[PDB]
Symmetry: C3
Subunit: 110 residues, 3 copies
């Protein structure tokens, strides 16, 4: 049948400040985190560990990729499941990569 849980995404209404950490409070109000799952929330942990995850939950997993160039402020984007990050080396930066048993190395050199 249907399986559901009460996990919210950052950016959703009814976020409870006293129920979360300051880190999550900061994510709640940032655009870059909007729509990523809020996995933490604490009455002491609201959605218990032993709660079924849903496929909709998986669609909301990710991390935030940012780039800074000098003083210029950070630009941020979400890396969700099956998104791609390309590291591209132009002149005169050489970017090479190896991959052994789940360990991926991106090398940078002149």
């Amino acid at each position: 049948t249907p399986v559901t849980n009460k996990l919210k995404a950052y950016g959703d209404a009814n976020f409870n400040f006293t129920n979360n950490s300051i880190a999550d409070a900061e994510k709640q109000v940032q655009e870059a985190y909007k729509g990523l799952l809020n996995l933490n929330e604490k009455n002491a942990l609201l959605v218990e560990d032993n709660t079924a995850a849903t496929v909709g939950n998986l669609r909301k997993l990710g991390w935030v990729l940012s780039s800074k160039n000098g003083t210029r402020n950070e630009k941020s984007q979400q890396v969700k499941h099956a998104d791609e990050v390309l590291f591209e080396g132009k002149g005169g930066v050489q970017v090479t990569s190896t991959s052994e048993n789940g360990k991926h190395t991106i090398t940078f050199a002149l």
Copy 2:
């Protein structure tokens, strides 16, 4: 209890190109994505084959990941999959310095000469 769902991986033979977007088609045919979970598969109706309120399985977790690529100048992208518990090492040599810092889930990789 044996919990299952109908989620496929990219590269699976019976993915239907007609019913899905160009973005998904592009992932479906790349070896780089092969075996990653296909979360965004649609039917004729342009609705998701597997609805949000479906049990996720441990098998599903084993197919989560993102694609990591490097491209030098004009040459074509070399790609790998970063799956759960994989490691990505950014290494500086040959005149390039790479350093890192971490604080409260905020990680920084810094590149210098």
Copy 3:
């Protein structure tokens, strides 16, 4: 929905060292791996401890991630844990330029100078 499974985290007790892989071993102590889900732990029958067709939990989701490492030439690796909703910044300074563009979830980070 109340649900459980037998998945443990790297760093947890009762890890059968001789029945598991070298990599898992290589991971179960490294601090950067601690608390990350041990997805592929084997049992005494030399099969996966938790089969593919088992419900995943929110507790599992809280343990998903990957390891981000850096190496400055000769020095040792510095490693840190990247979990869901962590941020990773790529910063360029004297005098590497690090710029980024994104389109349809493909993110390009470009290194110049």
